[PDB]
Design a protein around this ligand. Sequence first.
Ligand code: FAD
Ligand code: FAD
Ligand code: ARG
Ligand code: ARG
Lengths: 604, 604
Amino acid sequence: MTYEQLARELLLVGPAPTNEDLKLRYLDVLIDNGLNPPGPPKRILIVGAGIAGLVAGDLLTRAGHDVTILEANANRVGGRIKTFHAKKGEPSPFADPAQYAEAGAMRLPSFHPLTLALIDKLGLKRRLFFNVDIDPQTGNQDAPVPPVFYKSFKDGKTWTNGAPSPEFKEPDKRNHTWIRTNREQVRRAQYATDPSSINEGFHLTGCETRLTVSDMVNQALEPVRDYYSVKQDDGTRVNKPFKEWLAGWADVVRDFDGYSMGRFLREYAEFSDEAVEAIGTIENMTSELHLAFFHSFLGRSDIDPRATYWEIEGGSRMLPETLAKDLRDQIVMGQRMVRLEYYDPGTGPGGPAVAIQTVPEGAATQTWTGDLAIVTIPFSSLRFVKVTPPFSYKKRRAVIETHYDQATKVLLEFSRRWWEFTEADWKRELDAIAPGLYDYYQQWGEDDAEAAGGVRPATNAYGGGSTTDNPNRFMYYPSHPVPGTQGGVVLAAYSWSDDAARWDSFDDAERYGYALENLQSVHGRRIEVFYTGAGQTQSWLRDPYACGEAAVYTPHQMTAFHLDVVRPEGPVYFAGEHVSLKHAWIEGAVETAVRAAIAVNEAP
Amino acid sequence: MTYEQLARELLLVGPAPTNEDLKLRYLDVLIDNGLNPPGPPKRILIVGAGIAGLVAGDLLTRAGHDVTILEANANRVGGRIKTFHAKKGEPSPFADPAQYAEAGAMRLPSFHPLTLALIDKLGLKRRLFFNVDIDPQTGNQDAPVPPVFYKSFKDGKTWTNGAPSPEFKEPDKRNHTWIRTNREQVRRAQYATDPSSINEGFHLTGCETRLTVSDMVNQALEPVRDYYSVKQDDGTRVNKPFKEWLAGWADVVRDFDGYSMGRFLREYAEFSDEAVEAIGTIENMTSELHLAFFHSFLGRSDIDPRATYWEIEGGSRMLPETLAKDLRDQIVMGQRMVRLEYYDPGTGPGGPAVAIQTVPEGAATQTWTGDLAIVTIPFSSLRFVKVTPPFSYKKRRAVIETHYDQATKVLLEFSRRWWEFTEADWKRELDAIAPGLYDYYQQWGEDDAEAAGGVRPATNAYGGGSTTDNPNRFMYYPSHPVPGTQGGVVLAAYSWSDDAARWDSFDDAERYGYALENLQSVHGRRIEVFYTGAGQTQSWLRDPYACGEAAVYTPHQMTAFHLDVVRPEGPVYFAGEHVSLKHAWIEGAVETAVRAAIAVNEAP
Ligand SMILES: Cc1cc2nc3c(=O)[nH]c(=O)nc-3n(C[C@H](O)[C@H](O)[C@H](O)COP(=O)(O)OP(=O)(O)OC[C@H]3O[C@@H](n4cnc5c(N)ncnc54)[C@H](O)[C@@H]3O)c2cc1C
Ligand SMILES: Cc1cc2nc3c(=O)[nH]c(=O)nc-3n(C[C@H](O)[C@H](O)[C@H](O)COP(=O)(O)OP(=O)(O)OC[C@H]3O[C@@H](n4cnc5c(N)ncnc54)[C@H](O)[C@@H]3O)c2cc1C
Ligand SMILES: NC(=[NH2+])NCCC[C@H](N)C(=O)O
Ligand SMILES: NC(=[NH2+])NCCC[C@H](N)C(=O)O
């Protein structure tokens, strides 16, 4: 009110006095029971065949309703879940036809139970996603995968997917990947023990030099966490009682939504400009500084985002495609919504309540009618749709003003996994190709020029990723090799906002040359030997169906109209990543999709 | 120090104790005298053939130096000065081969003397640019064009281009153009007299309803203007004495650069969210809210930006192309800088001080050597250049962190100038095409659906532009008809940042359909009759040579590193729009170009 209702939307708390944990509700519907009870059968139109439209479409189809899912894309479902894999007719995206890589979603955390449990329910195998590079000679991933476990704020209630897996063990993290800033290059393990050398590269002085950018961030967020939490002597934090925990989060909204992350680190935490430059570079907050503090704080209110990540065997595309198998009659491809007409008594009486006119991608027009509608397309895409009658004023402003972040990924295929090589592996692998080739690159050295002469050391890393200040910014290595293959696809460039704005000023074929050179600036020129020449890129700002990476609020935007983002417009409901407060996560879309399916199922 | 030196950069004040007016210096060099005296002849490399590289190239060539201007574009000079006109071989961009429109710069203010005087010196005719629609039956534009006049802060010194023109008179403004927000549509003259109806459309209440968004902005900026200025009883403002005027501006930097424009209007001016929504919609500040207050405040510290604008006969391209005629031997086309190597004693001693390696657009490589260098390419473009040795740390961060705004223009050609039509003109012009066609569109009406049924009224406007909340946002009409023609090219869509981010998620041929429909939402469906089918668009975020519209700082960025943006890096100097504080203006580039030519001409 308004802050308390925002905190309820954030923490998934039902209305008073019950204060129901909506996460438990969503798990009961999505996994355990379904839509109980099945409401009056309705004709339901669903716009968009991403994970939100598919989750809601599956749930409502199995509940008895007559569902039609209109999808603008002509060949592919899943939306922002896109995997570069070899389709049957098409040529393969890479040289090795078995190689694949992600254009969108790639890692799924353990604290997102809906998405993980949905993956298991559909019978998909999931492996560990190595967010930090690991020791491949540790842990036990041959054991059955541990079940999905969620702990609720409500009393001591929990939710579990299956029997525990005591022999499954995560491999030990190495932190042997690189951090190359200001023409100097160390390893994450060395930066943790002595951050002084790198921090001085950002012209830091005094106490901030002997602190890692990670610790600096967490120390600054401690007084904010004190609103809803209590720091223990363990270093662990426990949440305050529900009354003071809900009011504590509501005070974070009141006192910090008007802050950007940059203004927070500069004025509230009193960090130097040099400290922010170092933090934003190594921790990926440069191009998020001018965006809302709350957006950045939400992913990282955890003080151990050292948790478990997962990825699907065969690609993230397995999740939406498996759902699409149970929706063959419902999914209509190649139909883009251009006109949304609905009837709000608060297309007329006695007739259909919702009329959607589509245009073939890319009959002249088709009109789809129904009783209720679920629009799961991004607001950057809804912006070009004509509507009658007008939505509520505050939602219209939400569709107009919602900032949509930019994101571009550049993928380079390699015939060998050179990032796992030791220096001895380099000597053998290069000479095997041609005698004397190893010594040849030793004498050649490294280019002094860098977009930010001794041969770079061997990376020798399994999974994880390296950070740099050249346009590539972040470079992820595959967590698991494709069996029967010898190569792998490196995520050579991955950035957001202004950093991504650099890449999406060029075309796709113009991206591979720069990304390889900037990859050599960190790992060495000699990696060019194993480059197959095949590359893939995905600019989400320039995708006609996504029109951006994800909804990312600027300061105060959430307080202004987010409570109006979720509110239905008569017979028109809204789901998707932008409707939740878990922006740019699959879980946020699955949350609002299940939430929308519940509301439309029991509608009068 | 640091604020005072920023205020000196802003106001073009030379160093103490002389406190020279640099604008007078730049006028003396660019127009009157030149580089006096001609310094030691040098080999100078200039990167980029936009207005900054051309102004500096012309000045240094005529001063005796050996200049080579490397331009990445293979066919066109001028950079962000781009005009859609019919070239000799090419097919014409529109149906009428005589029609032209601007892809970039289009209006030149009277308070930008360098650009206006440069246009006159090159012998180019300039007409009035009607920023607000005018009465074509008023004023006298047949008289000779008035000379360029500039008033300096220094004492009572002025600068004039030529003899005055007392008979030249600007046409009276009509404000008959449209403002269509929240499904309601009035005219700018009616909104000025009674803003109550439109403001209530943004859900405003109380005193703010009876105030135009324009007046609300100026009232909020009055205490800021009180820093450097004094409000008179005339309503006019005079500047304080130089001591308190320079320190006043330096206090604006100190107290407001950490503000965004949204945070300023919300926290300092205490406007409601509804007030900001109304202001940002009608006055074009929605997608600039999260950007620096200082960036937005700089264009509008004037309380009468009701001043005189100008445009060049034949297109804005006349200005760079005319300069390019005097640089035929110096300009090298189709060569993109990929590696910048220089020698800074503070490519070695005894040899060339600057070595630039280029790649043909789009010999494998070419190396260009010289004694000094002037890089006029945007920082979004320099970001992908490899450099040795590294620039100063703060400049490197400036190249990395500088936000570059997005901008897209959509141009639609029409066989007639329907925006000048009266209702009687509509009746005759439609029936002339086909009998009964006028009545046909009267019965057809207007689509109720809108991306935000009685036939829209006749616009009947000459010049100026209309404002709306649909994706087109701003629509400008040609100020002057092309003689011998009957049609004209409407700027159907023109937006920045998030508003422009919507359009540059589609391709060029995908833009014309939406822009015409949204144009009909304001002017009427019946305008489709005169649409020739030919369109032109320009997405500057997706231009490989611009990589964005212009440098636009986020909060605090200017205080952080702008003094390091201008600072030379040994033998490498920097010019361009981003180097000045007049971002997204031609004048800012001409300022830094002349400023760079002066420094490199007298270099030891
Ligand atoms: C680069 C990137 C990386 C990501 N990584 C992760 C990650 O590691 N983990 C994670 O959990 N999440 C990640 N995400 C987020 C996740 O991919 C999405 O949030 C998720 O797909 C939810 O999307 P959605 O269902 O809300 O909408 P979308 O997936 O975008 O679905 C929208 C659908 O609507 C269709 N559509 C659009 N316009 C129209 C129209 N006019 N008419 C009809 N149909 C239309 C589109 O074709 C599309 O299929 C990432 C996102 C990006 C961009
Ligand atoms: C949509 C829009 C509207 C505008 N309207 C106005 C207006 O009404 N009034 C006004 O005064 N200003 C306006 N401007 C601004 C004005 O057009 C520019 O500020 C002006 O052109 C100054 O540009 P510049 O010389 O600094 O650089 P640019 O004009 O951008 O020149 C850069 C040049 O460098 C070249 N180049 C780029 N990368 C490389 C490389 N790697 N190697 C070699 N060469 C390279 C490019 O090809 C280009 O020719 C507008 C700008 C835009 C985008
Ligand atoms: N602009 C953003 N913060 N986007 C989201 C980044 C995190 C993303 N969901 C991931 O798994 O990597
Ligand atoms: N993002 C911006 N404010 N860009 C500049 C807008 C003004 C522009 N120079 C013009 O003449 O119209």
